[PDB]
From Swiss-Prot, chains A, B:
Pathway(s) annotated for this protein in UniProt: Purine metabolism; IMP biosynthesis via de novo pathway; 5-amino-1-(5-phospho-D-ribosyl)imidazole-4-carboxamide from 5-amino-1-(5-phospho-D-ribosyl)imidazole-4-carboxylate: step 1/2
Top enzyme category: ligase
Organism of provenance: Pyrococcus horikoshii (strain ATCC 700860 / DSM 12428 / JCM 9974 / NBRC 100139 / OT-3)
Catalytic activity: 5-amino-1-(5-phospho-D-ribosyl)imidazole-4-carboxylate + L-aspartate + ATP = (2S)-2-[5-amino-1-(5-phospho-beta-D-ribosyl)imidazole-4-carboxamido]succinate + ADP + phosphate + 2 H(+)
Keyword terms of this UniProt record: ATP-binding, Ligase, Nucleotide-binding, Purine biosynthesis
Keyword Ligase attached: yes
Record keyword Ligase present: yes
Protein name: Phosphoribosylaminoimidazole-succinocarboxamide synthase
Length: 228, 228
């Protein structure tokens, strides 16, 4: 959809961010010039923040342009979703309005499977998929810690971390390592004052110009205007 | 759909089993003469078996015909599903065939909510709904024990307990008590030899005559032909 993966060797690979955007199970599609760059840069900033906080990520370095060098891992077939504020699919699962502030974070597990359109699963389904209760517990522990770090950091910049999606794999030591990306593609970010979307929802629901929203996040996070 | 509830006082009520059957979010409907009687009788047999095994149920007694006297409870808004063999909706959640024998039982939680069409939930959604992790753990512990007792009992009668749904509430002591019904409406039952459905799937998928299938379960469980 929005990224490619180039092998280097056993230890590492390239993760390239493309300008393509898709939504609604890729039934909606557009290209946004500079999106790749924005999403690459923001992933790096977030990975570096998490690393300083003692979160193990796959981030190794940058390879110019929209390319990151990342650790190769045995990927878990999961999308791990952490939610602070009601939005998106949660409205179809709990009878609560968009914008409802949750009493505590919700963690949701989704089975990465295109044939089944990524259905939500629980710990028992995960076990049948070969993922132990210990592993699931470690995964959710990390996700919730990531949540705390990102939401605090972003709030001190005028942004509500509404929800976000993470992916994980295992390294050669058997350690659980945070993978994939962290960007306005994979998070919901709302302005603290106006509650307006500064993320992929701008594209999903035609709420304005996506590049404009993604630049605004970047500027608010870095304090600099996007170079490209 | 298939049952009514008549108040008696604070302590108890009547649960009446009707001949109505519905499926596919009540878009399919029929009436089966004697179904109420069968489902009433079988619920009683199962509740009595579980009670002997130290499971707390709402079963108090029989009130003639298709009526049970049951303890009044503060109902949890849950449908608790235990699965031993792949069937039904599980095929849309895990890429496994109908009839796959699971390595261990799966427990699934569904939020009872007609507006949302009973969506599956996890422990975090349950907490937002006011159900503590301790309560959810006690509920699943009971469900899995119920599974062991029923599947053993039924296997010693030539029936595979494929999956089933339970409901629970709290009594005045704050204890978690098994409620609603246990019947061929709320379980999948397969013949051990032929793998054929002796349950509501006969109605769901026009696999034969429902009353015939429900009688066969009853006869195999009791050793007697249904009196009515
Ligand atoms: N495949 C997916 C599914 C959800 N997500 C993200 O997870 C969060 C939850 O999305 P839903 O409300 O669609 O479940 C959103 O921030 C969304 O962008 C994602 O980045 N990739
Ligand atoms: N509302 C519901 C949903 C499921 N069930 C039962 O739970 C089991 C799982 O059903 P699904 O495969 O439809 O999830 C089946 O035995 C079905 O009869 C029920 O008795 N009432």
């Amino acid at each position: 959809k929005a990224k490619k993966m180039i092998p280097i060797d056993d230890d590492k690979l390239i993760m390239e961010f493309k300008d393509d955007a898709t939504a609604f199970d890729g039934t909606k599609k557009a290209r946004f010039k500079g999106k790749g760059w924005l999403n690459a840069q923001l992933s790096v900033i977030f990975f570096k923040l998490l690393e300083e906080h003692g979160i193990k990520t796959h981030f190794i370095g940058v390879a110019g342009g929209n390319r990151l060098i990342v650790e190769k891992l045995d990927m878990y077939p999961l999308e791990v979703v952490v939610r602070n504020v009601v939005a998106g699919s949660l409205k179809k699962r709990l009878p609560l309005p968009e914008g409802y502030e949750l009493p505590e974070p919700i963690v949701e597990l989704y089975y990465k499977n295109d044939e089944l359109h990524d259905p939500m699963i629980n710990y028992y389904h995960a076990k049948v998929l070969g993922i132990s209760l210990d592993e699931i517990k470690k995964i959710e522990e990390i996700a919730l810690k990531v949540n705390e770090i990102l939401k605090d950091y972003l709030a001190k910049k005028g942004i509500i971390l509404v929800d976000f999606k993470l992916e994980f794999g295992k390294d050669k030591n058997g350690d659980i390592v945070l993978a994939d990306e962290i960007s306005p593609d994979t998070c919901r970010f709302w302005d603290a004052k106006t509650k307006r979307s500064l993320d992929k929802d701008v594209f999903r629901f035609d709420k304005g110009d996506l590049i404009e929203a993604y630049k605004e996040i970047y500027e608010r996070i870095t304090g600099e205007k996007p170079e490209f």
